Amino acid sequence: SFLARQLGVPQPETLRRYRAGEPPLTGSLLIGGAGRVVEPLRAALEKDYDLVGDSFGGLVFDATGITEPAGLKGLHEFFTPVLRNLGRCGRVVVVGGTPEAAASTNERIAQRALEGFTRSLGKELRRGATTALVYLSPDAKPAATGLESTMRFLLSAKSAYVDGQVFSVGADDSTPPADWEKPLDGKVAIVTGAARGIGATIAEVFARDGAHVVAIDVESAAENLAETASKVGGTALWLDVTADDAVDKISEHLRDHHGGKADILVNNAGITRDKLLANMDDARWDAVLAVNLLAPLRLTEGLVGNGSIGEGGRVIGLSSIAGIAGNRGQTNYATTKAGMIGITQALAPGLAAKGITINAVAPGFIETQMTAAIPLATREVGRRLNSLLQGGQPVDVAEAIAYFASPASNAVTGNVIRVCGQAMIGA
Amino acid sequence: SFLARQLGPQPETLRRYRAGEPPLTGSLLIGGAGRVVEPLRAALEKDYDLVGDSFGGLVFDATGITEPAGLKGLHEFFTPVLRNLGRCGRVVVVGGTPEAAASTNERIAQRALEGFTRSLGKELRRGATTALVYLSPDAKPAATGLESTMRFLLSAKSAYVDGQVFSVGADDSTPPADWEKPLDGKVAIVTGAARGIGATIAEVFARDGAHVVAIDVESAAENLAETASKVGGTALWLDVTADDAVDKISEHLRDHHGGKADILVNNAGITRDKLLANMDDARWDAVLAVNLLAPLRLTEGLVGNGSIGEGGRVIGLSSIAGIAGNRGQTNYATTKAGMIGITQALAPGLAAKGITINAVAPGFIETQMTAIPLATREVGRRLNSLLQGGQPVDVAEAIAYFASPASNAVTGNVIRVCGQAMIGA
């Protein structure tokens, strides 16, 4: 952090990321509040976590009990005497009931208001700690199995760069994977743009979690793609995702390798022909659309509609912060990455009725060749302009994607999660 | 200072409203394809120079784009003409409500537009601004309910609203007698109006025809009197958090305005910043009570006893902090997300009743609160596309737009007045 003097900014925390064998949080877990979540959750986490009843690993507050704005006082009552004790890379999650679904307008106002609390708290925490808000459907049964994959993602090292975000967990029940630490056991994952970078690390994490990976890139990058296939022990596929025949060239690979079925599609491939719109030609427009928006919609509609992905399937699309907040010289790119959010939102109901979920991850600043291609000052500021005072890592994005891919994450669809470390920029 | 230099800023002096001056710096060019271009050309022919010099405004009808391949339309219209956009020009893309699209393709493409407008917002020079307006595909072809939004955007009134998303329903609209005296004959209750923003909300309302009930607390007596005097309104002392609050306002409306008021403004707000780990009951409770409990109490109360009925308008004051959070403001932002909460929650019910409810989230606004040290003041001032802080008028204008009798199809809305501040969710 070489400009910490210039921008009056703290040294960053070394963010704790996932290691097999290590406990999920580094302290004890406090589950307070009142409502229909405190007891179930206390119950679901007894064994894997360290429930009070030193230093707090986690702080979960149950806001579902708060049915009017006057109840909000509780956030205060619970949080104030404990923040003093939140350990390194601690985890604070408020859980509320879906505001549009609330039993009163009064209730709805209190639950909506929660975001202001969580995102503000995100900005006060220290030494690597992060906040999250999670809404749960009031039609969720009292055990709330559908909430588990989400709580377990946040209440761990994996959500290391997920900060100040809002998760929406629907009403369906869920079944734990056989092994929370091998959640994608015997799953078939297609990962486009897997030669290098984020796509590659998706593959790695997927494979670490138990999945068989189909690593797609173009022939130009086969070598790095061979290197990825090897390392996850998956299979390569040389393919332009924009080609008429692409959907067919994937189903056939599935037919020769995987009984013709897949469980997970990750639309990760992308390109960035940047330029100001005043100076934008047709070719720099079209390419970006083709790769970035036209293809993922087609691979999604294609593979589902040809039966390659069916019940229990998962589709995670790679959005971007530019897609939400906009970015100078990226009217093409930000249109595609906004469209990506379109696909997630537009397709979710139809796919829901097919037992398929779809979500998007919007990465923030991530160390990659591409951030490495930005002028160093502009680059360094960018790297530092977030609650967590540093740039993300490709693992941090893959994690978010692997939380979505989870078989227990079935109650979570239509979600867009930023992996930005609570970057200051946004809509 | 080095980083200043290294990074590359030339703030345009922003053009604001002035009785008499054209609403644009040049001709309006309305293009694209779909259900909005023809009606808009006809609605706007009188007061605007349509392109049958340089571009005062550009409006692109995107409602005709039904698939992502069609997005390229945006590029074919804007690329060629952008170079000719003037000082404080306006760019507006009109689309169909994505959730209400006739296909998922359409939904994708239409949702995608915000990427475009927010980004373009960030490219425009000379203090020009971009906006996205979504129109219910259920609006009649006439598109009467859109006009008030098009006039507010396509004017200097909207000088500090940039990069925003406006969402317009299906309902038909009647235009005011006089677009320049929009609130003529209206009675507005503006709370927190002794100083700054509220005080300015009272002026703008006067300028537009309203009889203003300027409200404040006892301590503020002196500055209230000045407001009420300046705007030809009448003054009311009360603390909005009093149990008799609704009753006292109601007593006033009988004595002075036939029991009726048309618009309620929950402007009254206060801070009390403290890190949450040093937050006490008083600092929590005071803010909650003034900023969230009160505004609701007033609205529900004032609709519920009939003081504000059919044609009514409640505009509430959010804040970017309630959108993006902010250090030392768990209490404050809880309440201003609360305000959005009030807005989104009371909207269906208030619609069924003939009342629209909307919110405004100011950015950084030159005011007496903003007593913030130079270090911080300087960067919040400059961290938006317009490269400067905003004036109270810029906010009150936005509020006046909502408040128009012609803004009936506009409800549910939260609009930031931030000159597209970088900070958000």
Ligand SMILES: NC(=O)c1ccc[n+]([C@@H]2O[C@H](COP(=O)([O-])OP(=O)(O)OC[C@H]3O[C@@H](n4cnc5c(N)ncnc54)[C@H](O)[C@@H]3O)[C@@H](O)[C@H]2O)c1
């Ligand atoms: N900071 C970041 O690097 C960052 C931040 C936000 C979002 N993203 C997004 O995340 C995704 C991965 O990030 P990245 O920077 O590694 O992207 P990238 O530009 O490096 O592209 C990823 C891979 O996809 C491949 N690809 C391009 N066109 C293809 C096509 N026609 N068919 C098959 N493969 C194709 C490329 O060869 C490349 O190896 C991208 O969609 C990007 O837009 C990245």
Ligand SMILES: NC(=O)c1ccc[n+]([C@@H]2O[C@H](COP(=O)([O-])OP(=O)(O)OC[C@H]3O[C@@H](n4cnc5c(N)ncnc54)[C@H](O)[C@@H]3O)[C@@H](O)[C@H]2O)c1
């Ligand atoms: N000033 C900004 O840059 C900005 C930014 C974000 C949000 N806002 C919001 O806009 C509003 C206006 O604030 P401002 O910046 O002009 O500062 P301000 O405090 O001067 O204006 C608030 C007014 O409300 C009055 N007030 C306070 N409590 C009251 C009560 N109990 N009953 C009646 N009146 C009461 C005060 O007397 C004052 O006149 C606030 O709600 C604020 O949260 C302003």
